[PDB]
């Protein structure tokens, strides 16, 4: 593997996700595959669909083999069903050889391929636990780690706020400056991490830290927004409104039903505290208004939404950071992304250490 060749291997179509070019089958068919740290299947369009240009035609691959079963995956908003097979895959921007992987080829879906989207498959980079139909369906990354002799680590940078980089097998030094801070992976399914505190404009929300983890707090490149459990969401909104020097935001702005338009110093920074590998210490990842008041008269949408379930550190936040998914050492690293700059200003910050003496030893419900 060549990590420098992986720099800028992702394309991003402006608020629609980051995708990697992958070559599948013999002879190779080129697909555009969404990078998704919140799921664990490699799935691609297998039939024509209104909102995709191309799909993987298994009949044109001499090396494709069918496993003889299907899989149906259901999400909150949508679903797909596909045949499960095996075929050879290459990642031209990073690797010089092919690898034998499991592949789901989608033949029906509901609200999955949306209009104006540039990808035609998904690359789930989470753990075996989440794989469907079961954890015995070897994940793409597990196949790659073995077959490509890379470390069990990958890292991701998103540069859309200012494309991006998926570095499979390690950390590319040219993608960050300053320090990488690591937080433990609490549970290996999603990339579940422990949130200790949220601070808006330097003021803590005064919630029990369990409110941040109640369902789970995860890092998910396949989630668009920063998604917060309703009670946490409500507290954030109240704090941003109190701290913001403009007269008022509509209720519709906060729920995403209305845009705010103008023809930055008046909006607060938002910090998320994460436990260090040493439990007495934390670090904070901070986003500036430019990352959560998102351009769409220049008009803006709120980059935070309520969750009925998890606290999801999605693209809203990942646009600010180089994120290291260090599976080998059961930790997630953060460093501020040099590319996360707008109008000459960094739009994210990282700092530490801070004491955790004021919070419980376990903020995950137990």
């Amino acid at each position, epitope marked *: 593997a060549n990590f420098l060749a992986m720099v800028d291997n992702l394309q991003g179509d402006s608020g629609r996700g980051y995708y990697l070019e992958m070559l599948i089958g013999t002879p190779p068919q080129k697909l555009q595959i969404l990078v998704d740290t919140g799921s664990s299947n490699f799935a691609v369009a297998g039939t024509p669909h209104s909102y995709i240009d191309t799909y993987f035609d298994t009949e044109r691959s001499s090396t494709y083999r069918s496993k003889g079963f299907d899989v149906t995956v259901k999400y909150t908003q949508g679903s797909w069903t596909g045949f499960v097979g*095996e075929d050879l895959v290459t990642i031209p921007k990073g690797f010089n050889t092919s690898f034998l*992987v499991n592949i789901a080829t989608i033949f029906e879906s509901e609200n999955f391929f949306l209009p104006g989207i540039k990808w035609n498959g998904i690359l789930g980079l989470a753990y075996a636990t989440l794989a469907k139909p079961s954890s*015995s369906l070897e994940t793409f990354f597990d196949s790659l780690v073995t077959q*490509a002799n890379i470390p069990n680590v990958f890292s991701m940078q998103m540069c859309g706020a200012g494309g991006g980089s998926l570095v499979l097998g390690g950390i590319e030094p040219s993608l960050y400056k300053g320090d990488i801070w690591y937080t433990p992976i609490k549970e290996e399914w999603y990339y579940q991490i422990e949130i200790l505190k949220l601070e808006i404009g330097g003021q803590s929300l005064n919630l029990d830290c369990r409110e941040y983890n109640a369902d789970k707090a995860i890092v998910d490149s396949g989630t668009t927004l920063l998604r917060l459990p309703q009670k946490v969401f409500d507290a954030v909104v109240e704090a941003v409104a109190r701290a913001s020097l403009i007269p008022e935001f509509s209720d519709g702005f906060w729920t995403g039903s209305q845009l705010a338009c103008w023809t930055w110093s008046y909006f607060p920074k938002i910090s998320i505290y994460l436990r260090d590998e040493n439990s007495s210490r934390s670090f904070r990842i901070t986003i500036l208004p430019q990352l959560y008041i998102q351009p769409m008269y220049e008009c803006y949408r709120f980059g935070i939404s309520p969750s009925t379930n998890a606290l999801v550190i999605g693209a809203t936040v990942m646009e600010g950071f180089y994120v290291i998914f260090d599976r080998a050492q059961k930790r997630v690293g953060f460093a501020a992304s040099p590319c996360a700059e707008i109008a000459g200003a960094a739009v994210s910050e990282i700092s530490g250490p801070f004491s955790t003496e004021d919070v419980a030893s376990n903020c995950v419900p137990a």
Partner: nanobody, 111 residues
């Protein structure tokens, strides 16, 4: 899931072994299977992979033409026939599938 390798040994250069791996606790007939090797002080090295029906096989350049991967789905067994063995093939050889591995079998090639 359980993987247990066997068939390693101590051989001369130019020698041969037939490694086996017994599998249980999952549907072996649907699993991609892979052999890896690891010698002390050296990097982990992929050896060969075989698709679930056995028809698709891939090999590391370091073993091409000397080792052959195969499987018997009815017997839940993966194999590695190793011919023309060299000192540099000395390693623990292990089987891996879906992020699990067996404990491995030692192959030592010495004059």
């Amino acid at each position: 899931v359980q993987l247990q390798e066997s068939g390693g040994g101590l051989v001369q250069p130019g020698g041969s072994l037939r490694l086996s791996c017994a599998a249980s606790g999952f549907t072996f007939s649907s699993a991609i299977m892979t052999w890896v090797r690891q010698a002390p002080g050296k990097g982990r090295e992929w050896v060969s992979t075989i698709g679930s029906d056995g028809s698709i096989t891939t090999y590391a350049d370091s073993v091409k033409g000397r080792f052959t991967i195969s499987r018997d789905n009815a017997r839940n067994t993966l194999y590695l026939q190793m011919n023309s063995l060299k000192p540099e093939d000395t390693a623990v050889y292990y089987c891996t599938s879906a992020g699990r591995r067996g404990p491995g079998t030692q192959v030592t090639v010495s004059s």
